[PDB]
Design a protein around this ligand. Structure first.
Ligand SMILES: CCCCCCCCCCCCC/C=C/[C@H](O)[C@H](N)CO
Ligand SMILES: CCCCCCCCCCCCC/C=C/[C@H](O)[C@H](N)CO
Lengths: 64, 59, 278, 238, 252, 60, 59, 278, 238, 59
């Protein structure tokens, strides 16, 4: 029962991969990774990763 | 920096009012409801060789 | 009223005057008027560089932080809230100030205070109008430690009282700095041995705000949220700076993740579109 | 006792106000002003300064310095193409994150002419000519050299003066164009074509690099404050 | 011809035969502090020509895959004679600078350098929420080197050329006073910086005034047989320097 | 501190007002005016123009 | 003790406003959004031996 | 605008003029300009002694007492509350006034009134807006004894009515003293035989305030708390005084616990720090 | 009927107001003013007056008059130290509760020069010299006599004129320093060193006492009103 | 019956304000925070036979 984050930010063009999409209990420092929603393509100038910070909120994630 | 105009009043029987503009923009001002001029010479009589109204204007 | 420069007419030319061939190696931006390469006509131009000036660019009421505090909590530390004053926790106003290196301005400050009734069993009350207190502490003063502390008695500190339902509070603050201008960027250390803390964190020193409900402990929990709106005015700026490319990570440094220059393409030449058909 | 009628728009908080406020620090002694060199009074003093355009941004060169290097070499057949992009400072991917583009993305209307400077960073024995051309919209993108020589072009001879200036004039029907993408204010195309070749002597490297700059003229203007589409924040920075 | 330029300061002289044009500042020439803007009260020490003279820094070798170099100038001139000593005995100092960067090649070489003076270049750390050591920022007269890919050394500066350490696009660094050393036509990277700070006099060790950067955009490239070793030498002279607040020997 | 008495008719919204308002876009640069032919200053310039009368409107 | 300036207005087709300062401090005043001057001669053309733009400016 | 004095330049000196050697035994503060011992330069100084003046030091709205009273109590003495007017029950404004011995000023008075619903079974009410009455009694007048007394009918006494939700009440009061100035310190007795009461308690004689709810007895208990804010203005002061070191004990005398002069040290010389290592 | 728009900041109570108010006692007859000697118009008329510095506050002498007595005697080796403290009027423990420090703790910025007066309260046959020295910060505290003679010092000869004035000038980079402790506005050190010795004849007491004063010059200034960190109250005084 | 004074402003880089007194009493007026004069000649130098500061002032 450590401190945990919320569900990661639902983007309208990106969904989570499949070790992360089911499991709860995101501790601090945990990185999660997104994949393109099926019909889309990657923007190579942006890295699709999100770190949960000390204040139990994810980093800013906009459009991957 | 005030300006004094006349109020719209009845006829056959010149009262003044005051106006001060407070804001820095021209879109902020009150609407100009005191321009009564007209010129219906571009809609009526829109012709060349301007007619006389006493002549038959043909032949 | 200073209009933009006009276009003068021109004609054919065959001479040893070459405005096009310059040397961009001399740190020099060429000043080629459009009437120097092609034949132009007389255009009397009426455009005004008004809404690109530094005053017209910075004097908007931006937002800097949100502050939450309750009026009935079991812990005494969530019955009031504080904020050390910087302008570096929202990226928009931070980036707009980081166009320039040194700035000098007065701040017009507005609070927008909203209260939400929290969830409880006894939720049907008859509550009178809430009253808020917003106290400023200069750098070095005494700080409160509870809502019923006698350090809130504002004998010298400027504090602002507000009753729910009226216009938002607004007050102006002059140039509260010890230097000749503010410093957006400081490349130095705190200690003379070049140790300590690095960057602009040595030069903040602004003091802090304190927020509480003036009313007593109510019978039902109500949370209030106050939004500080800074709005710079009477602005001067010096030695400009390229705008920041990468995204911010913290409020006390400039540390970043390396982002590329721009959005990519597929090939280096252009052509007509290769989509569906005629 | 004055008869006062409150008008609509009372007791609101509008963002771009110009009202007066009481001072929280009365009779405060402001520190004296110092003459710091380099005062900015207008953002348009900044946009008139040259800055390099990341032209070669093809799908991997973004993450290096190679986005700024435009390739040029000797060609086995003249009349080819060198590069090209779309003249949209703030919408097009090429000059999106430039100094003019980053001043220009806080706005929504622009007007005036735009300069383009091409520095040839090659050998001192190498020589050759290029065709720096602007084509107003209404037709397609030109596909030959003989279709792009109908526009507003300049032939640039590489010599001792190693840089040229392509000044793109203001050809419009409206007084302003949008900084974003709409079809009513399309703005044209910038293409560059090999005029003859690159000709080098023996034991001199063939493959060289052209660098492109961009700036604004003395009649450039912007109108509508909006927020930039590039600032993004998820939580507070602490 | 205007390709020839002589610069005389103190007892040192730099002559160039392939100069292009000397840049001077933001339009301002360096000058001593007037007594209408001064803050300190005791008599300043405008020493002599003993500090206003050219000092030669170390040379870096420009290879085919080199990326960039930087220096920190109120700290880089810390052991150059009487400038370094007057730095070490005074509390306040104030000076403009005349930077002259040399690099030469033959007419068969190609490559282009960018020489910028960046005021208040606040560097970013490699790993994000971690302190920076003083040796990784400023190494005296020795240049620190950018990289091409992102770096992850502990307590080090994030050193990628496409972000220039500060976190901006590197093609936007032409807003500061700059020139280009095009090997086709230049050797004159001369930039006369005035004093730029928000206080009329400042400490030399605790505050870094600006940062010289030499970033090659069009890389050095040559055919086989030419001289492969091309050095770059940076020469810097303080101008209109004065000092105030004398005390014992400082922090080395 | 001015003694102000609010009169009746305060805090209403009347349709045909002629009041002043703050601008939401301060110091905005309005585009220059162009001489478009055919300006209407009065609706009575329009009503003095001939138009055909549908007289034979008998039921079909 | 009032002062009268001009309102910002459109071109090609001088309306005045009024302003009174009420408070004792200079930070209390309204923002000065009517200074339109500029000088881009310190950022562009930041050189010595000022060029001509018609000459080659080298050799 | 009276600027501070400037620094004039100086040079070397070898003479029988000795500004440093003075005699501090003559009750005389030496007037050594900094240009008299070391060589100085010309500094045109632009500092203004503005916010150190007596008006800029004393004219802040300080706080003097808190007053509590209920609107439904079984005892009739807690349905209203009183306060004999002095400025000597909060230490901050008392110490700031005790910088000087005699003062003379006008008082701008503000009340900040807050009501809290007390705890009861029937806590769900629908209460209209509360109305307060703040009555001043000059020295010698008739005093109320209940909330429904006819002594509250304010025919001559100045009284201030306030409705909950508006701006706080504010009124100015002129120099209400019988002497030529107020007395912060009075070294004497009340009776001519040098007996009686000692100190400044003979010279207060200010009258008192009375507070009640104008409304009738409600169906649920509500306590109200009113804070009196005095704010001196048009101020003159005479014969200054060393600031008080020890802490106050009462409001009617100057009696104290003996405190030492200052915070202690460990040795009489200074040196470098002896903490951890290089 | 006047069109009035209420601005934000209405119906608040700000502490440092300068508004007008109605009088509760209308047409009141104020008693006539009397010319009481010794009028204060500025608090800086008070801070320019000498007051004794409790220098010898070593861990027990606070609770006596011995905090003000600085010891001096004949020394068996010259070049020693006499006392020393840190020049921070309002943060340092030595001149914390002084008259200049108690005016100066209600502020938050200060500027200007500070005077220091040293009265030798010894015998009339005793003689000797001292080294009154100020060292600007940036280095450490000086540890010898020959390191502290590099600063801003004065050599004081004890004679018929029994007091000297060490005037500490204004050596700063900012126009103000903080009255509290931060590292950006450190201010220096004041040390005193035996120059030769104390030399007395026979049957005259060796151990004497130096008293130190402090005052401000005619260019001293304070800026930011805050509350003092020394006032403390727990309940109302009744 | 208004009076115009100057606002307190910074140095090295005269703006006016207005004030009207509305009430019949002198205690009603705003506080006078613009008197900057001083005279520390009664606290410092409070002696007879005024000293010279260059002489030893004894013997
Ligand atoms: C009783 C109301 C008082 C409210 C106090 C809130 C604001 C007071 C702090 C002063 C505002 C300074 C604004 C920031 C200054 C610099 O620009 C930043 N450090 C960024 O450089
Ligand atoms: C209807 C509202 C009237 C409110 C009455 C409250 C204040 C009236 C009392 C006069 C104020 C005098 C202030 C104190 C005077 C002296 O300075 C003190 N004794 C301290 O010396």
């Amino acid at each position: 029962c450590n401190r945990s984050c919320e569900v990661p930010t639902r983007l309208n063009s990106a969904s989570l991969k499949q070790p992360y999409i089911t499991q709860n209990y995101f501790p601090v420092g945990t990185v999660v990774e997104y994949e393109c929603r099926p019909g889309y393509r990657r923007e190579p100038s942006l890295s699709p990763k999100l770190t949960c910070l000390q204040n139990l909120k994810w980093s800013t994630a906009v459009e991957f | 920096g005030a300006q004094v105009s006349t109020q719209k009043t009845g006829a056959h029987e010149i009262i003044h009012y005051t106006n001060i503009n407070y804001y820095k923009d021209a879109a902020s001002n009150s609407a100009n409801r005191q321009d009564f001029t007209q010129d219906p010479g571009k809609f009526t009589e829109p012709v060349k060789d301007i007619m006389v109204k006493s002549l038959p204007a043909l032949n | 009223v200073v209009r933009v420069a006009d276009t003068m007419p021109s004609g054919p030319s065959n001479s040893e005057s070459i405005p096009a061939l310059t040397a961009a190696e001399t740190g020099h931006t060429s000043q080629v008027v459009p009437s120097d390469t092609i034949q132009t006509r007389h255009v009397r131009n009426f455009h005004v560089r008004s809404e690109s000036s530094v005053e017209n660019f910075l004097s908007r009421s931006a937002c800097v932080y949100i502050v939450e505090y309750k009026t009935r909590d079991d812990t005494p530390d969530k019955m009031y809230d504080s904020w050390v004053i910087n302008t570096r926790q929202v990226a928009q106003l931070r980036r707009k100030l980081e166009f320039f290196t040194y700035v000098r301005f007065d701040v017009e400050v507005t609070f927008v205070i909203t209260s939400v009734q929290d969830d409880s069993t006894r939720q049907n009350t008859d509550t009178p109008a809430l009253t808020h207190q917003i106290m400023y502490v200069p750098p070095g003063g005494p700080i409160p430690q509870a809502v019923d502390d006698y350090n809130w008695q504002t004998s010298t500190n400027p504090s602002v009282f507000w009753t729910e339902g009226n216009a938002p509070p607004r007050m102006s603050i002059p140039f509260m700095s010890v230097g000749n201008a503010y410093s957006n960027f400081y490349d130095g250390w705190s200690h003379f041995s070049q140790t300590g803390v690095y960057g602009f964190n040595t030069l903040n020193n602004m003091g802090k705000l304190y927020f509480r409900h003036v009313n007593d402990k109510t019978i039902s929990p109500i949370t209030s949220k106050v939004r500080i709106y800074f709005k710079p005015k009477h602005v001067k700026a010096w030695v400009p700076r390229p705008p920041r490319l990468c995204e911010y990570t913290h409020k006390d440094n400039v540390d970043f993740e390396p982002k590329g220059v721009t959005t990519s393409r597929t090939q280096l030449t252009i052509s007509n579109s290769t989509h569906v058909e005629n | 006792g004055l008869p006062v009628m409150n008008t609509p728009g009372s007791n609101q908080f509008l963002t771009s106000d110009d009202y007066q406020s009481p001072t929280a620090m009365p009779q405060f002694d402001v520190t004296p002003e110092m003459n710091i060199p380099g005062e900015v009074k207008n953002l348009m003093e900044i946009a008139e300064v040259d800055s390099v355009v990341p032209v070669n941004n093809v799908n991997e060169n973004v993450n290096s310095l190679e986005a700024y290097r435009i390739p040029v070499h000797s060609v086995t057949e003249t009349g080819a193409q060198v590069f090209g992009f779309t003249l949209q400072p703030g919408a097009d991917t090429v000059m999106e994150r430039t100094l003019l583009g980053e001043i220009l993305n806080y706005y929504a209307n622009w007007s005036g002419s735009i300069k383009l400077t091409f520095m040839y960073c090659g050998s001192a024995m190498a020589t050759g000519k290029f065709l720096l051309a602007y084509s107003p919209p209404g037709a397609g993108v030109p596909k030959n050299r003989r279709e792009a020589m109908l526009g507003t072009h300049i032939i640039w001879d590489i010599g001792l003066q190693s840089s040229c200036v392509l000044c793109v004039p203001w050809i419009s029907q409206t007084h302003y164009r949008f900084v974003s993408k709409d079809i009513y204010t399309d703005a044209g195309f910038i293409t560059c074509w090999y005029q003859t070749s690159i000709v080098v002597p023996a034991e001199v490297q063939n493959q060289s690099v052209i660098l492109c700059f961009v700036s604004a003229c003395n009649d450039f203007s912007v109108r509508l404050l909006r927020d930039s589409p590039f600032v993004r924040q998820t939580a507070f920075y602490q | 011809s205007d390709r020839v330029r002589s610069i005389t300061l103190g007892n040192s002289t730099i002559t160039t035969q392939e100069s292009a044009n000397v840049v001077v500042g933001y339009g301002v020439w360096p000058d001593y502090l007037s007594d209408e803007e001064a803050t300190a009260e005791d008599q300043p020490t405008q020493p002599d020509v003993a500090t206003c003279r050219f000092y030669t820094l170390d040379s870096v070798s420009w290879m085919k895959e080199s990326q960039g170099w930087w220096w920190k100038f109120p700290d880089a001139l810390r052991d150059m004679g009487l400038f370094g000593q007057n730095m070490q005995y005074h509390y306040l100092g104030r000076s403009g600078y005349t930077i002259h960067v040399q690099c030469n090649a033959s007419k068969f070489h190609q490559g282009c350098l960018l020489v910028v003076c960046v005021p208040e270049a606040e560097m970013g750390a490699a790993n994000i929420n971690e302190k920076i050591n003083r040796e990784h920022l400023s190494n005296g007269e020795v240049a620190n080197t950018f990289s091409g890919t992102k770096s992850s050394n502990t307590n080090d500066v994030q050193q990628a050329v496409f972000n220039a350490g500060m976190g901006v696009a590197v093609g936007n660094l032409t807003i500061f006073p700059h020139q280009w050393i095009n090997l086709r036509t230049n050797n004159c990277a001369t930039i006369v910086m005035p004093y730029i700070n928000s206080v009329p006099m400042d400490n030399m060790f605790r505050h870094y005034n600006f940062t010289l950067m030499i970033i090659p955009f069009a890389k050095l490239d040559y055919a086989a047989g030419s001289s492969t070793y091309i050095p770059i030498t940076v020469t810097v002279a303080p101008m209109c320097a004065e000092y105030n607040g004398l005390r014992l020997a400082g922090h080395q």
